[PDB]
């Protein structure tokens, strides 16, 4: 049941911003590993004396990578005279974030009808302000409120090409990589306490709980009116013999933060073939594949949705499959994106729920916890 | 003239250590961009709760990438009980270095006969101590003294496989990339004042000035007994209409530091073909190529050393050529390795001076400054 209670008009996920120590090296690694093109830049070459920011795109997916320059380059500037293209940026905030958390997501950005109104309504409804609305070149309005930990929910609204002050990059420097990723499906946070996190975020957005159906976690999913902006949140479950990966996350991250980004592929088999080709030559590694037992049990579950060929393809790529009462979900998880066992990526493809495809079709793979335990003891039989 | 005045026995360059915010992403970028294999690791998976360190190798070239974990992971440890594999590592030092300089070289490591003696003799002769000698697993001794800025000269000595506590990496995770790079030829520092820098380093090493033959710099080269460890140092020249790139370096780096690493290739044409193939897909970019004028003038200079084919190959790859009275130097420069206009890489190949090849054969490309200015005004003719 969807009460459609959004307190302001939300459109879609707009971009994700990583705070880095060196934006160049992270962006180049991610571009090769995920098949994303260099699309826009804001840095010294565009007059930005404050931060280096590079945008990667694949389909509608936008990854922004930002790092601070020496504060000395901009020490004569004041906020009215800043050369930063993202005026919410702060040298001290960024260094504090990165020294505390390592490489991770600073901003989950969603497009809204009116960022100034979204900010005002959010703060009026309990949101903790992070950066007030600012109009960029009379063209774009950006505002930020706290989401969890040091992650912000960033509102972006356009009167009418990423942000003012960003330049499109030279097509020679812009190689058209594409492994099939097309958009951000959902963004997942880890918190110490799920209840208060849910109460806070649902409180200021009006996002509603999304319909679901011990593995170390409890979780719930907050969703916008059309359920296209999806924000799952996890908490740890303690004293389980096998230590909760949520707890491990919280310790290595120094607290709450973004756990993973799920990226929708238009063809998950092509995406995984292309990413796995590059795992050992600069790209991303994947979690260990489930045993052949798991795939020997997939016929009895989704044999009506995937052929015997497409299930064999799942086995060679290590893809997981789960199923709602409305659709089917193909998913796989990368190993952590950086030094710490914190942030990772999920690749997904959803099958079903056509009207366009409705949001969250197939769920989020909850059933794959117990099926993994089943396949583990069935493999040792 | 070589007085062979080394105050202790120096062997060869051993490794270069980068201090990073995220060692994983920098190492993966560098591996793909330069064709270096993942060789050894020291990180959480090997019991290191202090820093993540990944070693890349190509031939005898060793690049180490290190970043700190949360200090909270090791807060119960003391130096006698540390899990760091490089006991000179300090969380505060590393964060201070990276916040001050961005991505850059922390350690220039050379192998010596006896690291404890090299440290003692160096400090007795004016070297500023950075980390005292420590014996690792009764097997390797490591000690550090200040070189310039926050760069240290690291002494490594073996009684008898990188360092104790480092594990060889899984061959599956270890793809045998190789673009032909084989060793570190020299490592170049930028300082505000060349004289006092030279007096200091030559003072504690006994390194001698290496034989040479306004572009914004003055420079000199310090060399070990057999001139295989080579350490050029630059200072800016001020008031030149065109601002000194050394000065620009010092401003963006927040002072003195390592400017570039020159990596010897066994086949610079293959290396540049392979690196340029990857420039736009995660690798490294190269400085703008010299005009065809420069190459039209190369016949009259090195037409006795390179064929008309090999000179055409230089033109398509943008390779520069210079010549001593003893040998010939092929060289090219990358764009900066990270966000800041600070550190970059040079690829080189030396032709001549065979006895083995003697160090510094062909010089360091000083003549390529004036020849570049000549080719610029000759191209506009
Ligand atoms: C620590 C640990 C966890 C598990 C499962 C094991 C187990 C093992 C089994 C398979 C394996 O490789 C495959 C793999 C391992 N992961 C990593 C863990 N994970 C997930 O994070 C996961 C997930 C399903 C959905 C999602 C989401 O999207 C979420 C949510 O959940 C909340 C709601 C909203 C969202 O959006 C997420 C994050 N599912 C199935 C999962 O398994 N992902 N794929 C690696 C290890 C094991 C055996 C047999 C023996 C040992 C010693 N271990 B062992 F202790 F290492 N171990
Ligand atoms: C700032 C600036 C510098 C120069 C040369 C120019 C000029 C231009 C010409 C070519 C170009 O692309 C090619 C390129 C540009 N670099 C970057 C600068 N560099 C070097 O750092 C360089 C070097 C030779 C040897 C070495 C070493 O190893 C050293 C030492 O030196 C000290 C002793 C020991 C070592 O070991 C080093 C670092 N050589 C020839 C050099 O040129 N490297 N390759 C890019 C720009 C220009 C024109 C025609 C018009 C404009 C507006 N400009 B413009 F102002 F952008 N401009
Ligand atoms: Co998910
Ligand atoms: Co050089």
UniProtKB/Swiss-Prot annotation, chains A, B:
Q: Which Pfam families match?
A: Glyoxalase (PF00903)
GO CC terms of this entry: cytoplasm
Query: Pathway involvement?
Result: Amino-acid degradation; L-phenylalanine degradation; acetoacetate and fumarate from L-phenylalanine: step 3/6; Cofactor biosynthesis; prenylquinone biosynthesis
Q: Where is the VOC domain?
A: 12-158, 183-335
Its main subcellular localisation, reduced to a broad class, is cytoplasm
* Keyword Coiled coil among record annotations: no
- Which EC number applies? 1.13.11.27
According to its UniProt entry, what is the function of this protein?
A: Catalyzes the conversion of 4-hydroxyphenylpyruvic acid to homogentisic acid, one of the steps in tyrosine catabolism.
- Which protein is depicted? 4-hydroxyphenylpyruvate dioxygenase
The protein's organism comes out as Arabidopsis thaliana
Classification lineage: Eukaryota, Viridiplantae, Streptophyta, Embryophyta, Tracheophyta
Provide the gene name from the record.
HPD
């Amino acid at each position: 049941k969807n009460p459609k209670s959004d307190k302001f008009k939300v459109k879609r996920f707009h971009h994700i911003e990583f705070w880095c120590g060196d934006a160049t090296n992270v962006a180049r690694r991610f571009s090769w590993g995920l098949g994303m093109r260099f699309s826009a830049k804001s840095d010294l070459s565009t007059g930005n004396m404050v931060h280096a920011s590079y945008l990667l795109t694949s389909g509608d997916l936008r990854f922004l990578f930002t790092a601070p320059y020496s504060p000395s380059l901009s020490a004569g500037e004041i906020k009215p005279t800043t050369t930063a293209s993202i005026p919410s940026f702060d040298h001290g905030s960024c260094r504090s974030f990165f020294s505390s958390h390592g490489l991770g997501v600073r901003a989950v950005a969603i497009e809204v009808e009116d960022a100034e109104s979204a900010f005002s309504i959010s703060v009026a409804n309990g949101a903790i302000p992070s950066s007030p609305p600012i109009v960029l070149n009379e063209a774009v309005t950006i505002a930020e409120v706290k989401l969890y930990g040091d992650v912000v929910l960033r509102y972006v609204s356009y009167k009418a090409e990423f942000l003012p002050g960003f330049e499109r990059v030279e097509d020679a420097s812009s190689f058209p990589l594409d492994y099939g990723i097309r958009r951000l499906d959902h963004a997942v946070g880890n918190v110490p306490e799920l209840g208060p996190a849910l109460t806070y975020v649902a409180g200021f957005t009006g996002f509603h709980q999304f319909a679901e159906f011990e593995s170390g976690l409890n979780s719930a999913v907050l969703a916008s009116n059309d359920e296209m902006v999806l924000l799952p949140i996890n908490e740890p479950v303690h004293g389980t013999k096998r230590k909760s990966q949520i707890q491990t996350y919280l310790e290595h991250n120094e607290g709450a933060g973004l756990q993973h980004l799920a990226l929708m592929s238009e063809d998950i088999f092509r995406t995984l073939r292309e990413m796995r080709k590059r795992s050992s030559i600069g790209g991303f590694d994947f979690m260990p594949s489930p045993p052949p037992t798991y795939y020997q049990n997939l016929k009895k579950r989704v044999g009506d949705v995937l052929s015997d060929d497409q299930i064999k393809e799942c086995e060679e790529l290590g893809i997981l499959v789960d199923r709602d009462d409305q659709g089917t979900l193909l998913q796989i998880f990368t190993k952590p994106l950086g030094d710490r066992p914190t942030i990772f990526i999920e690749i997904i493809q959803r099958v079903g729920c056509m009207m366009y495809q409705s949001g969250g079709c197939g769920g989020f793979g909850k059933g794959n916890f117990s099926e993994l335990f089943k396949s583990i003891e069935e493999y040792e039989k």
